[PDB]
Amino acid sequence: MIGLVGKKVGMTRIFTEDGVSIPVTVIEVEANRVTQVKDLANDGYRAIQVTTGAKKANRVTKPEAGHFAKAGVEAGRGLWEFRLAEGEEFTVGQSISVELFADVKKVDVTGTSKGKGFAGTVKRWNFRTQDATHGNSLSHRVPGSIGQNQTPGKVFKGKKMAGQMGNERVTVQSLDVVRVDAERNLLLVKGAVPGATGSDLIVKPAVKA
Amino acid sequence: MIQEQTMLNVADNSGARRVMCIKVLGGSHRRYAGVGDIIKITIKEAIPRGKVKKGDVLKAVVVRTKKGVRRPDGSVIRFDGNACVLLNNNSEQPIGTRIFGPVTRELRSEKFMKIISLAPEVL
Amino acid sequence: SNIIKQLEQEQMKQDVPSFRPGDTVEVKVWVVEGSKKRLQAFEGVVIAIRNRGLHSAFTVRKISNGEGVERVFQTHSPVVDSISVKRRGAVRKAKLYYLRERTGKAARIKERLN
Amino acid sequence: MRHRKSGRQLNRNSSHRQAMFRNMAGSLVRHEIIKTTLPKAKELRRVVEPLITLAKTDSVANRRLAFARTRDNEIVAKLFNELGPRFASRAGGYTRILKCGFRAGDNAPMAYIELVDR
Amino acid sequence: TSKWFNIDNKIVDHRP
Amino acid sequence: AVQQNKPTRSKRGMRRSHDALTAVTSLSVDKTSGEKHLRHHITADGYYRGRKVIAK
RNA sequence: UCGAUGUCGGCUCAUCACAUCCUGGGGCUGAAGUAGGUCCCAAGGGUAUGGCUGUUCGCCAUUUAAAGUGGUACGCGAGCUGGGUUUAGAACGUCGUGAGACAGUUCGGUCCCUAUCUGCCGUGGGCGCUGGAGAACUGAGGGGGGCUGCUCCUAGUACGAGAGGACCGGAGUGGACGCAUCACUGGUGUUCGGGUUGUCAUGCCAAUGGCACUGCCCGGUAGCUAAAUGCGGAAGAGAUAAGUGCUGAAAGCAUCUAAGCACGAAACUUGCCCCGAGAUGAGUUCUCCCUGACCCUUUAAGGGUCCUGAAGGAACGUUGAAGACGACGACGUUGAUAGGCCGGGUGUGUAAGCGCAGCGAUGCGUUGAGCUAACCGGUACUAAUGAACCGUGAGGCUUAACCU
RNA sequence: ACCGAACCGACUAAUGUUGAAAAAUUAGCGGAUGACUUGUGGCUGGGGGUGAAAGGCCAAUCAAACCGGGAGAUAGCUGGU
Ligand SMILES: N[C@@H](Cc1c[nH]c2ccccc12)C(=O)O
Ligand SMILES: [Mg+2]
Ligand SMILES: [Mg+2]
Ligand SMILES: [Mg+2]
Ligand SMILES: [Mg+2]
Ligand SMILES: [Mg+2]
Ligand SMILES: [Mg+2]
Ligand SMILES: [Mg+2]
Ligand SMILES: [Mg+2]
Ligand SMILES: [Mg+2]
Ligand SMILES: [Mg+2]
Ligand SMILES: [Mg+2]
Ligand SMILES: [Mg+2]
Ligand SMILES: [Mg+2]
Ligand SMILES: [Mg+2]
Ligand SMILES: [Mg+2]
Ligand SMILES: [Mg+2]
Ligand SMILES: [Mg+2]
Ligand SMILES: [Mg+2]
Numbered sequence A: 001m002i003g004l005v006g007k008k009v010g011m012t013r014i015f016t017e018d019g020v021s022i023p024v025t026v027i028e029v030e031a032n033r034v035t036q037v038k039d040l041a042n043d044g045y046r047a048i049q050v051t052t053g054a055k056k057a058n059r060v061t062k063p064e065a066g067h068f069a070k071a072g073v074e075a076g077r078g079l080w081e082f083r084l085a086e087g088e089e090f091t092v093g094q095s096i097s098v099e100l101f102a103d104v105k106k107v108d109v110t111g112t113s114k115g116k117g118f119a120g121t122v123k124r125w126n127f128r129t130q131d132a133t134h135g136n137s138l139s140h141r142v143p144g145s146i147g148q149n150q151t152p153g154k155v156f157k158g159k160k161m162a163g164q165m166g167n168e169r170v171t172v173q174s175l176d177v178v179r180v181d182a183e184r185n186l187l188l189v190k191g192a193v194p195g196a197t198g199s200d201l202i203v204k205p206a207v208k209a
Numbered sequence B: 001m002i003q004e005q006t007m008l009n010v011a012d013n014s015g016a017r018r019v020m021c022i023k024v025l026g027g028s029h030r031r032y033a034g035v036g037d038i039i040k041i042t043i044k045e046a047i048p049r050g051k052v053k054k055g056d057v058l059k060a061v062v063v064r065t066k067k068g069v070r071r072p073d074g075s076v077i078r079f080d081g082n083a084c085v086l087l088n089n090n091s092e093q094p095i096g097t098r099i100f101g102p103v104t105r106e107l108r109s110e111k112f113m114k115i116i117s118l119a120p121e122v123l
Numbered sequence C: 001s002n003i004i005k006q007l008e009q010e011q012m013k014q015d016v017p018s019f020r021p022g023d024t025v026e027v028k029v030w031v032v033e034g035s036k037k038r039l040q041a042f043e044g045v046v047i048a049i050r051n052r053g054l055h056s057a058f059t060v061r062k063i064s065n066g067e068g069v070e071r072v073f074q075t076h077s078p079v080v081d082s083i084s085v086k087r088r089g090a091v092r093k094a095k096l097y098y099l100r101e102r103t104g105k106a107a108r109i110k111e112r113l114n
Numbered sequence D: 001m002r003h004r005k006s007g008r009q010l011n012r013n014s015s016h017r018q019a020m021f022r023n024m025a026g027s028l029v030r031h032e033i034i035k036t037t038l039p040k041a042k043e044l045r046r047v048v049e050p051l052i053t054l055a056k057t058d059s060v061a062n063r064r065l066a067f068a069r070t071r072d073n074e075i076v077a078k079l080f081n082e083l084g085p086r087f088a089s090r091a092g093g094y095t096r097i098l099k100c101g102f103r104a105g106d107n108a109p110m111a112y113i114e115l116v117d118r
Numbered sequence E: 001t002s003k004w005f006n007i008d009n010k011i012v013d014h015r016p
Numbered sequence F: 001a002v003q004q005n006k007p008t009r010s011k012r013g014m015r016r017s018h019d020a021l022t023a024v025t026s027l028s029v030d031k032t033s034g035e036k037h038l039r040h041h042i043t044a045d046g047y048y049r050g051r052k053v054i055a056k
Numbered sequence G: 001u002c003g004a005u006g007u008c009g010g011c012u013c014a015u016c017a018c019a020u021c022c023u024g025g026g027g028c029u030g031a032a033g034u035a036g037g038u039c040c041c042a043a044g045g046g047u048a049u050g051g052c053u054g055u056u057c058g059c060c061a062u063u064u065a066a067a068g069u070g071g072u073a074c075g076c077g078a079g080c081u082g083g084g085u086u087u088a089g090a091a092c093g094u095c096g097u098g099a100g101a102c103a104g105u106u107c108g109g110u111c112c113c114u115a116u117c118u119g120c121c122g123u124g125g126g127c128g129c130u131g132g133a134g135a136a137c138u139g140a141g142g143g144g145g146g147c148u149g150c151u152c153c154u155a156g157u158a159c160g161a162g163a164g165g166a167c168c169g170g171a172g173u174g175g176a177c178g179c180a181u182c183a184c185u186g187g188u189g190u191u192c193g194g195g196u197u198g199u200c201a202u203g204c205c206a207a208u209g210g211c212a213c214u215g216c217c218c219g220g221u222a223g224c225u226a227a228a229u230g231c232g233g234a235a236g237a238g239a240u241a242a243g244u245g246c247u248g249a250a251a252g253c254a255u256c257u258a259a260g261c262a263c264g265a266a267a268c269u270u271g272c273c274c275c276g277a278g279a280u281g282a283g284u285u286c287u288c289c290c291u292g293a294c295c296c297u298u299u300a301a302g303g304g305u306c307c308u309g310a311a312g313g314a315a316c317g318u319u320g321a322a323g324a325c326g327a328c329g330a331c332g333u334u335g336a337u338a339g340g341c342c343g344g345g346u347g348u349g350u351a352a353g354c355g356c357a358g359c360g361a362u363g364c365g366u367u368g369a370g371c372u373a374a375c376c377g378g379u380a381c382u383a384a385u386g387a388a389c390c391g392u393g394a395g396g397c398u399u400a401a402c403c404u
Numbered sequence H: 001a002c003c004g005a006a007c008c009g010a011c012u013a014a015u016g017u018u019g020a021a022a023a024a025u026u027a028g029c030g031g032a033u034g035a036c037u038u039g040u041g042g043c044u045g046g047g048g049g050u051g052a053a054a055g056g057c058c059a060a061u062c063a064a065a066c067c068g069g070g071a072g073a074u075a076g077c078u079g080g081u
């Protein structure tokens, strides 16, 4: 089944009447507008393309404005694509809301996880530090050894080293759907989702099950 | 959060006063043992006429921790000590006949119903 | 934001009494054992109060059978059935964390008479 | 990582930063235009403007609060006697930064920071 | 003159 | 550590391939004085967006 | 190799083999069940903490499903150490007349390097992709992940004289590991509030500020974070290994194989997550933009002058949960991008001034007061200036199909 | 004799090691009325001095200083021709 594009708003708790407090993430999922529908004949695969929110009229460039006017919908802040299964079909210019997610139990939430910048090996790969004392000299959080001697005489690919950590596409799977709230455009899922507050997320029905 | 080499008080009347957690049973590379958890102990102090002597190695159940338990609404119950109840190596029922101090509902299982029955206060 | 405040505000309680640290307070909480649901009372001195709206909590301390117990209650939780202050305490601090290190006659708290 | 943190460290420790921002606030109030490096000008906004608001609301306690932040009775007097009623109808933004190039000595972005009614 | 790690004895006599 | 072989003028030029400065794209004319200046900078005489901001 | 290839052990990071320690599949059993013995397949993941000792090894204590055997300069000192063995001191035992000597012992004893190249981890610039440009994709390929305990039901059933006690299947709940996050419990919070010692200063009292590790301490917002709390490992499919077969001759019988057919594992190909058209084999879809004139010549994918400057981009500025720098994201007056301001929230804890009680330190009233950083909702007060700059003028040849 | 600054020294750790320094810095450390420490001057000379003894010190050099000389020692050895 297709998904919907929302934005992470923040986290809250939900107290329920047997007195347990469910940590929930609130995702504002307002009406996504289907812009382009792709098919096996013209494009070679079946997908829909949706847009959401609004964007400044002076900053929607002419190709984007032409595309949105061809679909006949107001310009949004981006374009995303969802692959279609066989039993389901959509039309161009069509609004989708959270009432689609009214009857799902678990979702997969995809978002761009926060950037930690250039991070070290201890933060990035759970490496162990060496001794802070006992003679240790300028080698407390260093990576250690990165190879073997003459054979092979090289560092193997995929060696866990320091570098850019975070700011990258991350999926959290099989999160419970605590509440679907159609009139306020809210999806409350149980647990944390990737990314910062006020940020784009793609929520799909769960693929594992 | 009790680990190896940790000194714990005895919350029963077996005859020991202090014990030392020397192993956290029930898993490989297991680090900590929370409230309601079986550990292996050795006895470091003893009452002169107790049921156990200094230097015995036997089991114990951690029943109070300063780290405390968390309750499903988000609550936390903390104590001002680490306290355990001694158990036989094989039977894993308590040695003493009375338990001092409060214990927690996290021990409410069939394995520790004797402790729950004899406790003065169950929080 | 506005959405989160709206969700919290429709969840919050409407009748939490006004208490300050140093107060002796009785908190009656729900306890479920077997299938029976009953009220257990925890009486002690509030040593900490964290106000965050729905996420507000308060730390109470008692001496129970010779052992000092701290409980942190969530103020708006359904399990915290009732809060009632019995004695107003006169302190000059917002967090009374020295009452852990103090015991007996040293942990006495003056009464606030206004 | 400095996610959602404010202020500039400005290659100085905390006491040095506090001392020079007190000095720059005193100089800016005395002269009504000063030429300084651009990040120092932005931080000088963040230091100076609450002092002009405190000057808008006149009281003995407000004068004592300004003497504790500016440590200068002349600056406090000029604030509460002139820049209070001069900016009494303006809601914030009492200053202005105009970029004016790079220092000859070390290639810096200089900027004039001035009060708006000068 | 000479480097201290060449005058040293623990690292010069490294493979006796 | 230190080189085993001498790098060439070819590799010296290849490393310095990225060292080239970029000139300013275009200067500005002021609508009162008419003087070229850097954008969002006050001019040499003391004008900015057509107002004499600094004396002299 | 002596115009030098640094040695045992520990730490840090590993990677490969399979002669498999666990988990997985099976044959035989002197296999009743439980538990085993032995052999065959199988390298996906997993594969102890402490005492002694310089130790690897070993012994011992207690765990675990298990505590695998090996290669890698007995992996790893331009990554750490320096306990051991290796200089110079000194002593013991023994040997020597002696200087001295002991894989005998004991106490003490300098471990350098700013990385050019290859490699690896990240992140950009240029050009290409055949008119220019803005997006969204397809997926050749590449990587990550792949562990498992215990309890309960089936069932005290099958099996067994009893003791004991299942296969197959299902439910729950843990350990280790990994990703994400900050709502909770916490840590930090030298940018907020207060207590206080010494001293100096603001003319002095009162009130404040500087300096003493933030002077010492007590709390603590936002952010970052773990000990906190969400999720994960799969199911399924395809082709199989050992193994089990069906039909069936060669060999009238028999036979799993020769023809034909079916099962069969954590290994293999997918399924799950991520990168991914420099995939030069440079792909697809949608949209947007440019429809002037003239002159020379080695007359062709030629050069030159005037007019023209689009879509878009860059630059500049305000900046950001983005960031070493580039880069990426938001905004630029038709504006909430930042700062300020207003209101709130949070934190601290009842400011200063004045009055009252007291001889006085001090207490009480005004008073949950004052102040309050990064937070929340707002607001054009200040700053984001009109422009200028790069990018063009319909886009080659040949051959097929369509319209005409 | 004891505790502790000046002053004398140099036990441990980190930094530095093409250093700030051809032996130091920082934080701790030992002596501190004595077999103490220090300023000016003098004396002892190289198979010699001096040594509360380490083959230690004698001008950043010590199992025999430095300087000039025999001297272009010698080199069955290495490099070059
Ligand atoms: N490396 C140290 C000690 C040292 C000096 N000279 C030496 C000669 C040989 C060995 C060590 C040293 C230094 O530079 O100060
Ligand atoms: Mg960041
Ligand atoms: Mg470690
Ligand atoms: Mg060193
Ligand atoms: Mg900010
Ligand atoms: Mg600097
Ligand atoms: Mg200071
Ligand atoms: Mg060579
Ligand atoms: Mg060589
Ligand atoms: Mg095999
Ligand atoms: Mg597989
Ligand atoms: Mg061992
Ligand atoms: Mg080796
Ligand atoms: Mg090895
Ligand atoms: Mg080594
Ligand atoms: Mg090496
Ligand atoms: Mg040694
Ligand atoms: Mg010797
Ligand atoms: Mg003798």
Ligand SMILES: [Mg+2]
Pocket (backbone or CB within 6 Å): none
């Ligand atoms: Mg020897």
Ligand SMILES: [Mg+2]
Pocket (backbone or CB within 6 Å): none
């Ligand atoms: Mg080194």
Ligand SMILES: [Mg+2]
Pocket (backbone or CB within 6 Å): G143
């Ligand atoms: Mg892989």
Ligand SMILES: [Mg+2]
Pocket (backbone or CB within 6 Å): none
């Ligand atoms: Mg928060």
Ligand SMILES: [Mg+2]
Pocket (backbone or CB within 6 Å): none
């Ligand atoms: Mg806290």
Ligand SMILES: [Mg+2]
Pocket (backbone or CB within 6 Å): none
């Ligand atoms: Mg603090």
Ligand SMILES: [Mg+2]
Pocket (backbone or CB within 6 Å): none
């Ligand atoms: Mg403060």
Ligand SMILES: [Mg+2]
Pocket (backbone or CB within 6 Å): none
């Ligand atoms: Mg005074």
Ligand SMILES: [Mg+2]
Pocket (backbone or CB within 6 Å): G210, G211
């Ligand atoms: Mg001073």
Ligand SMILES: [Mg+2]
Pocket (backbone or CB within 6 Å): none
């Ligand atoms: Mg399978």
Ligand SMILES: [Mg+2]
Pocket (backbone or CB within 6 Å): G248
């Ligand atoms: Mg046959």
Ligand SMILES: [Mg+2]
Pocket (backbone or CB within 6 Å): none
């Ligand atoms: Mg393989």
Ligand SMILES: [Mg+2]
Pocket (backbone or CB within 6 Å): none
């Ligand atoms: Mg603003």
Ligand SMILES: [Mg+2]
Pocket (backbone or CB within 6 Å): none
């Ligand atoms: Mg408050």
Ligand SMILES: [Mg+2]
Pocket (backbone or CB within 6 Å): G351
């Ligand atoms: Mg005060």
Ligand SMILES: [Mg+2]
Pocket (backbone or CB within 6 Å): H001
């Ligand atoms: Mg003496």
